[PDB]
Structures are given as C-alpha cells and as structure tokens.
Design a protein around this ligand. Structure first.
Ligand code: Y01
Ligand code: Y01
Ligand code: Y01
Ligand code: Y01
Ligand code: Y01
Ligand code: Y01
Ligand code: K
Ligand code: K
Lengths: 242, 242
C-alpha cells in the first residue's frame, strides 16, 4: 500500500545518506585527527618531562581545568546568563551555557523544556506565517507598481536567508573578532538549532555583564534568524508534511 | 484582527515564561556556582603554589588539555564515530563529537545538514503517523476483544513515552554505570534534541571500537525515542499548527 511503500522508501534514502556522509567525513578528517593527536601528545610529553609532573596529580589538573572552563567567562548564572540559558533551552539549541549541577535544577529544566517547547514552536510558526504573508503582500505591491508564483516566493526566501546569514556573520566578525567564514558557520549552526560549532558568543571578557546592548542585539538577531528559518520551513518543507 | 491578536498574545506569554525561568535558574544556581568557583580556585592556587607553575606556561597547559579532551576517548573519526556524528547532525543534536577543524569539512557539514534536515523530519513524521495508526488499531482491537477518544490516545502516548524513557535510563545506568536520575536526564536531553546535558555516552574505554552491539543498540534506541517523540508531537502539538 502507499503508506508502507512511502515509509520503506524514506528509510532507505536516509540510511544511504548517512553512510555517504560518514564515509566522506572519515576520509576527510582521519589524517587531521591523527596529526592533531600526534602534536598534542608530543607537546604534553615535552611539558611533562620539563616540569616533572607526577602521573597521579596529572588527572587532578585535567579535572580542575575542565570544571573551570565555564567559570573563565565570568559569572554565568546571573540574570543575563540565566536568560541566555533559558533561551537556548526553549529554542532547543542547548549549548553555550553550563549544565546545572543540582538534581532539582535538572528536574526544573526538564519541566521547563516540556512546558515551553510546544509554545515556542507554535509562536515561531505563527510569526513565520505572518512574515510570509507580509512578504507576499510586498511582492504583490512591487509587481503592481512596476499573480505571484511559488518559485518567486522560494527565491525571495532564499535571498532573505542568505542576506540575514551574511549580516549576522559580518556583525559577529566585527564584534567577536572572528573570521568571516567562521562567523558564517557559527551563524548557520545557531540558526539550524544544532548548538555546537566550536564557537560561542557572549563568552569573552565578561560581555554578558558589560555590554547589555550587544546581548540585546544578539538575542534579536537569534530571534529574527529563527523566525526566518521557520518561515522558510513552512514555505518549502511543511507542505510535504500533511 | 485574529492573526495580530494571536501573534501579540503568544509573544507576551513567551517573554513572561522566559523571565520566570531565568529568575528561578539564577536563584537556584548562583550559590552553587559561587561555591564551585571558590573551590576550584582554591584548588588551582594550591596546586600552582605546590608545583611552582609559571603564569606564561599555565595557559599552554589549559589549551593542550582542552584540545585533547575529545582525543581521550580514542579515534573519534572512524566509521562508527563518523556515523555517530552524521546521526547527531541530521537529528539536530549536535553534541557528543568534536567539531571538524577543516574549512572544507565545515562547508560539507553545512551542505549535509541543509540537504538532510527536511528528509529526516519528513521520515520521522511519516513513521510517527504510522506508529499512531498502529496504536489506534491496537487500542480498537483491545476494546473490541474486551470508538476511541483522544484522551485515551494521549494517555497511551504519555505512558509509552514514560516507559521508553525508563527503559533507556535503566539500560544506560547498567551500561554507562550512571545514576538512574542522571541516566533519565541524559535520555530526556537526547530525545528532546537539546544535545548537551554534561553527559555523553559511547565515550568510555573506546566503546565505539570494541562494542559494536552497544553502538547498534544505542542507535536503535535513539531512533525509537525520536520516532515516539515525533508521534507525540503530531498527536498533541501538530493540530495547533494549521
Ligand atoms: C504533555 C505536554 C507535551 C503538553 C504540552 C502543552 C501544550 C499542548 C499547550 C501548552 C501551552 C499551550 C498554548 C498556550 C497558548 C496558546 C494561545 C492560543 O491563542 C488564542 O487562544 C488566541 C488565538 C486563537 O484563537 O487561536 C492558541 C493556543 C496556544 C498556542 C496553546 C496551544 C497548546 C499549548 C502549546
Ligand atoms: C537594511 C538592513 C538589512 C540593515 C540592517 C542594519 C544593520 C546593518 C545594523 C542594525 C543593528 C546593528 C548592530 C547594533 C549593535 C551593535 C553592537 C556594537 O558594539 C559596540 O559598539 C561595542 C563593541 C565594539 O567595541 O565593537 C557593534 C555594532 C553592532 C553589532 C551593530 C552592527 C550593524 C547592525 C547589525
Ligand atoms: C517587538 C518585540 C520583538 C520587542 C521585544 C523586546 C526586546 C527588544 C527586549 C524585551 C526584554 C529585553 C531583555 C530584558 C532584560 C535583559 C537583561 C539585561 O542585562 C542587564 O541589564 C544586566 C547584565 C548586563 O549588564 O548586560 C540585558 C538585556 C536583556 C537581555 C533585554 C534584551 C532586550 C529584550 C529582549
Ligand atoms: C533549499 C532546501 C531547503 C531544499 C530542501 C530539499 C527538500 C525540499 C527535498 C529534498 C529531499 C526531498 C524528499 C525526498 C524523497 C521523498 C519521498 C517521496 O515519496 C514518494 O515519492 C512516494 C510516496 C508518495 O507518493 O508521496 C515523497 C517526497 C520526499 C519526502 C521528498 C520531499 C522533499 C525533500 C525533503
Ligand atoms: C517488552 C519490552 C518493553 C522490553 C524491551 C526489551 C529490553 C528490556 C531489552 C531489549 C534490548 C536489550 C539491550 C540489548 C543490548 C545490551 C548491551 C549489553 O552490553 C553488554 O553486554 C556489554 C556491556 C556490559 O558488560 O554490560 C547490556 C544490555 C543491553 C543494553 C540490553 C538491555 C535490555 C534491552 C534494552
Ligand atoms: C527495521 C530497520 C529499523 C533496521 C535498520 C538496520 C539497523 C539495525 C542497522 C543497519 C546499518 C547498521 C549499522 C552499519 C554499520 C555500523 C558500523 C559498526 O562499526 C564497526 O563495525 C566498527 C566499529 C566497532 O567495532 O564498533 C557498528 C554498527 C553500525 C553502526 C550498524 C548498526 C546497526 C545498523 C544501523
Ligand atoms: K540541539
Ligand atoms: K535541536
């Protein structure tokens, strides 16, 4: 029947894509990982030989450094830090902040995510629909002053996504002193709800407590990018759902 | 009009929820963060005084330890590691694997996510719909052998979610030697597409290369949990979309 055939066809393509991606990633990163591992030991062996660090005390230093990594960025559990953590939790980003060490805190975070994810999803969907309607109205007005097809809507949405990504990359490069490609990759990771791209904002020189304007701009940009992504998904992906 | 009223009403509730969550998180974690910071310095100050570590060379040790953290789990860019990374990328988890250090690799990952996210979403939606249909058929057969309402479907879905979460928590506690609550929290984080909860599996004693059965079971459990979550979202959340 149609349902079973569709499901079986969908399963196979995903597995094939997974295999292809895994093979390409392995073939592209095996040598780099080997070189990085070789360099890092050599360096750690040299420094341990120079400083005569005992094996037993070496693990304690690693644990202390790993546990103190979030604390380097300042006080992450302030009002701004808590707001950023809540934003990441509700938007299913889940990176940049430090996981709470309290069982009650973990339970509260679980309940918060459960009660907040559908609301955020519905709000994003509604705002994306409103943005799509506004874009359609603007296109109709432009055509009248100078019948809209989908392809035009798809092209407009893609151009808007590219422009937003470029603007965010430029802003983050000017603020975080990052490369243009690295800033673009970080913006893409943030807007795709992945969360981890080996980069994080609002974690340098205590920017969470001394630059409220930067935090507000980052939050507004994140919200705008998420709304644009949701609108694009509604335009191109949601038709194939039901 | 209805559209604008809905759009403006959703935003206010979302902002109020964000403020409440941030306030609660701050009030619950400020003291814990302060105590952890105090303990970690005291320890680092004591160890630096004991070993007489120079300030200039201290940063190099931190950089080496931070860069070598993924490498401590073995060769992460093998076939199993690449498959795990691809699974995390397509499922918008984005945690458990080190980010690639190559610009070409980053571009390939971006293209992979772009071309794979809608396909995975559609496959999950279709499989969740099939699971919902099968559950409805089973409930109808049970009622006949011993007219189904929604509330019954919602209760059945919630019970299935709780059972799957408990089974996953028990399995991870028996395998990863974690606490029951910690395993439950990790399973909830994984199934909610958050990704980071300070707990990561398949990263101990090289389990990615010596326990293929464990990796296969973990992948199957992740897929089953994601399918169940998608089915629940279709049952309760998707009606309010369109
Ligand atoms: C077991 C767990 C997953 C339950 C999760 C609860 C959700 C199913 C609830 C909680 C908050 C609810 C929302 C709270 C507020 C609103 C605004 C409400 O808007 C109006 O009443 C005015 C506009 C209109 O008429 O639609 C529409 C429903 C909605 C999105 C609700 C939809 C259903 C939500 C997401
Ligand atoms: C027609 C449309 C598409 C253009 C959109 C306007 C942007 C080009 C503007 C609007 C908001 C601006 C941002 C508002 C606030 C800031 C913080 C500002 O930070 C500081 O001044 C302190 C840090 C430092 O010293 O650089 C740096 C510029 C930036 C990112 C601005 C960069 C330019 C932005 C993105
Ligand atoms: C038309 C709609 C989209 C308007 C939405 C309003 C936002 C522009 C406002 C409403 C609440 C504001 C936030 C309320 C509280 C704070 C805490 C504030 O932190 C501090 O003042 C202390 C730390 C520091 O100094 O940065 C930083 C800005 C921020 C995140 C604000 C950023 C801008 C927000 C999101
Ligand atoms: C600019 C970016 C966002 C483009 C993203 C591409 C997607 C819009 C495409 C890529 C893969 C496509 C899917 C590839 C395979 C199929 C199986 C296909 O199933 C059948 O042909 C049999 C069942 C039936 O008759 O519907 C239905 C469409 C679907 C889900 C496609 C829907 C549209 C997808 C997600
Ligand atoms: C009726 C339904 C609801 C029950 C579903 C059956 C589960 C209780 C079974 C099915 C698959 C089983 C798993 C299959 C494989 C493994 C790997 C296995 O690992 C090893 O044997 C090596 C590691 C070690 O030494 O413990 C540990 C048990 C576990 C998690 C099993 C635990 C019990 C599971 C989840
Ligand atoms: C009805 C449907 C859901 C069936 C789906 C099939 C899966 C049960 C199979 C198909 C491909 C399999 C994977 C193919 C390749 C590998 C690599 C394999 O790794 C190795 O053999 C080397 C490393 C090690 O020793 O673990 C570990 C299992 C895994 C992930 C397999 C896990 C089980 C998978 C996902
Ligand atoms: K995520
Ligand atoms: K996500």
């Amino acid at each position: 029947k149609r349902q079973n055939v569709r499901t079986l066809s969908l399963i196979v393509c995903t597995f094939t894509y997974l295999l292809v991606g895994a093979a390409v990633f392995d073939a592209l990163e095996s040598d780099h990982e080997m070189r990085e591992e070789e360099k890092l030991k050599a360096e750690e062996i040299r420094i341990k030989g120079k400083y005569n660090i005992s094996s037993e005390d070496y693990r304690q230093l690693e644990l202390v450094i790993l546990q103190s990594e979030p604390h380097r960025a300042g006080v992450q559990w302030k009002f701004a830090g808590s707001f950023y953590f809540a934003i990441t939790v509700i938007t299913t980003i889940g990176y940049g902040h430090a996981a709470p060490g309290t069982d009650a805190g973990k339970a509260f975070c679980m309940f918060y995510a459960v009660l907040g994810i559908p609301l955020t999803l519905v709000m994003f969907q509604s705002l994306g629909e409103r943005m799509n309607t506004f874009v359609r109205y603007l296109l109709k007005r432009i055509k009248k002053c100078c019948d809209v097809s989908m392809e035009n809507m798809v092209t407009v949405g893609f151009f808007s996504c590219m422009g937003t990504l470029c603007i965010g990359a430029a802003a983050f490069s000017q603020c975080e002193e990052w490369s243009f490609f690295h800033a673009y990759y970080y913006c893409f990771i943030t807007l795709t709800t992945i969360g981890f791209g080996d980069y994080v904002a609002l974690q340098t020189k205590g920017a969470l407590q001394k630059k409220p304007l930067y935090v507000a701009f980052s939050f507004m940009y994140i919200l705008v990018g998420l709304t644009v992504i949701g609108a694009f998904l509604n335009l191109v992906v949601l038709r194939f759902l039901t």
